Write an enzyme that holds these catalytic residues in place. Structure first.
Site, mmCIF file in Angstrom:
data_model
loop_
_atom_site.group_PDB
_atom_site.id
_atom_site.type_symbol
_atom_site.label_atom_id
_atom_site.label_comp_id
_atom_site.label_asym_id
_atom_site.label_seq_id
_atom_site.Cartn_x
_atom_site.Cartn_y
_atom_site.Cartn_z
ATOM 1 N N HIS A 158 0.849 -1.229 0.000
ATOM 2 C CA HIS A 158 0.000 0.000 0.000
ATOM 3 C C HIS A 158 0.872 1.261 0.000
ATOM 4 O O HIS A 158 0.301 2.354 -0.114
ATOM 5 C CB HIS A 158 -1.099 -0.015 1.079
ATOM 6 N N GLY A 160 2.708 5.784 10.444
ATOM 7 C CA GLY A 160 4.136 5.636 10.094
ATOM 8 C C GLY A 160 4.713 4.283 10.504
ATOM 9 O O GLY A 160 5.866 3.986 10.107
ATOM 10 N N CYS A 191 3.562 1.272 9.719
ATOM 11 C CA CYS A 191 3.389 0.202 8.700
ATOM 12 C C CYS A 191 4.765 -0.300 8.238
ATOM 13 O O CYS A 191 5.715 0.508 8.124
ATOM 14 C CB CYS A 191 2.559 0.656 7.506
#
Ligand SMILES: C[C@@H](C(=O)O)N(C)C(=O)OCc1ccccc1
Ligand SMILES: [Cl-]
EC number: 3.4.19.12
Lengths: 305, 301
Positions: free
Chosen positions: B41, B143, B145
């Protein structure tokens, strides 16, 4: 979101951990620059630990009486000296993994990460608080002696704790890295018990701030209080007195949630006198006191090392 | 002695964390040998959040649309492919800090350590379990991820989780290191919710065994139960069913304490009926379900 008991990343300390063996005693050493630090009791037999004479036991020892192993590599000891209850072994090689570090002494109520080690191999890491009675509620097995506790501030490791012994209650005692015990303990096999413990008030308040930041709000209320009023309930419930220094330290969380500390104290006064009435805060049924205000700010703002 | 929520030492994972930027989006990647793994993503924009066509967004990128930074160093991307929900960026440098590693897909009830990272730098380490509903109750801000979960069994790092998203209840969802989601979740901002969560029954029993090994006996009783009667009670408390596999697994803790698994099951039934009566077990006033039988044996004498 979410809120967990969170340790510092342990990598900078993992690179400093070594095995130290004297006679039949193996435990852990901290290798920084050209010195290995470990508990002085490494030089003791069983008979010695009853009434040890460390001065005498140590002068009797030579540099080659200490086996220092960093992984599958032998370090050469070229010096040995004692500072309080810590042994310092000078070695011929500076640790090329030595991080930016300093030795710090912490206050009761302050938290730190422990890197539990066995035979010089890091095994696990957990967050502890120095209890008001100067014990830590650790998790240590035979061979964990010399395991260390630390904080990180930017790129600097602050070493605050070295594990020496277990107490008959299952709580743990140790020194700063200059060899001064936390609490009224000694490194001899004798009868020692922790002074009865108390709850770290300013930390419970910090945790209630973390709960509110995570949308756990049920315990809030319209009421406020005063330090004197609260400290009378606190004394009664074996809580530490809340000083004005403590109220200043919570200033950030107070402002960032629109709950003033004495407003949040009003909530704590009611939880102590009433209970949680079948409810939880951040998935605890207890009032958690091992998160400092700094811990809560760090975790909820995403501070990095 | 003592009993603590204990994470694995994070150093072997710390030397693998990098920052991955695509467009205006920055998150964490995992640098192993000459590959950087991150949530796919990272290639979405603001209009791509609901129904991204990943194959379409990816074919429109060149290697040089990906900014990968390992501390002060910029790594050079020489390749990109997608495996399920994980993006893999081939780089011209193998990570010199790559440890012995493998990828393993875990089952609900398994525990692991998470190294929470922001901009490729570690913030902290904690222990988690995969919930029966295939979520984790993590501590993750924007942040985070690309942060991973791992076990370290004997110098080898087993990567079992990569963080992708937070669901509306504040619980976390992600993939194995082959990019397959845990549970019925997709890397889309379409409305998703986890199944009702249950307590990991086998883990509660393991922790009651740990309490006995540490010299607690106040919760024990003189009763036994059948496996069937136990499951009929436990499920009324949103407890997971206990299987014969779960019984087998507790065998060694049963042996070491001399308390039969179905005797300890009777204890748990009673604890569910009574609560703790203001008492604690290993510091908790709740029954803890994020220690496995394997964790209890590793931490206990
Ligand atoms: C694992 C995942 C999948 O289909 O890949 N799963 C079974 C699943 O139900 O994820 C939620 C979802 C899938 C498709 C359309 C909307 C929402
Ligand atoms: Cl598993």
């Amino acid at each position: 979101s979410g809120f967990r008991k969170m340790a510092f990343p342990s990598g900078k300390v993992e690179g400093c951990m070594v095995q130290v063996t004297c006679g039949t005693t193996t435990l852990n050493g901290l290798w920084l620059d050209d010195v290995v630090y470990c508990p002085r009791h490494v030089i003791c037999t069983s008979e010695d630990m009853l009434n040890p004479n460390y001065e005498d036991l140590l002068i009797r020892k030579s540099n080659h009486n200490f086996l220092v192993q960093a992984g599958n590599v032998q370090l050469r000891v070229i010096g040995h000296s004692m500072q309080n209850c810590v042994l310092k072994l000078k070695v011929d090689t500076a640790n090329p993994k030595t991080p930016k570090y300093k030795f710090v002494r912490i206050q009761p109520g302050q938290t730190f990460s422990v890197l539990a080690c066995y035979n010089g191999s890091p095994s696990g890491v957990y967050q502890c608080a120095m209890r008001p009675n100067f014990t830590i509620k650790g998790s240590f097995l035979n061979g964990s002696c010399g395991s260390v506790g630390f904080n990180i501030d930017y790129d600097c490791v602050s070493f605050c704790y070295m594990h020496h012994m277990e107490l008959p209650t299952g709580v743990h005692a140790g020194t700063d890295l200059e060899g001064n015990f936390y609490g009224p303990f000694v490194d001899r096999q004798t009868a020692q018990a922790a002074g009865t413990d108390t709850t770290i008030t300013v930390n419970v308040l910090a945790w209630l701030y973390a709960a509110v930041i995570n949308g756990d709000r049920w315990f809030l209320n319209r009421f406020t209080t005063t330090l004197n009023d609260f400290n009378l309930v606190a004394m009664k419930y074996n809580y530490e007195p809340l000083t004005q220094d403590h109220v200043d330290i919570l200033g950030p969380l107070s402002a960032q949630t629109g709950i003033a500390v004495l407003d949040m104290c009003a909530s704590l006064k009611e939880l102590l006198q009433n209970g949680m009435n079948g409810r939880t805060i951040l998935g605890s049924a207890l009032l958690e006191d091992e998160f400092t205000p700094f811990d809560v700010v760090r975790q909820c703002s995403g501070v990095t090392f």
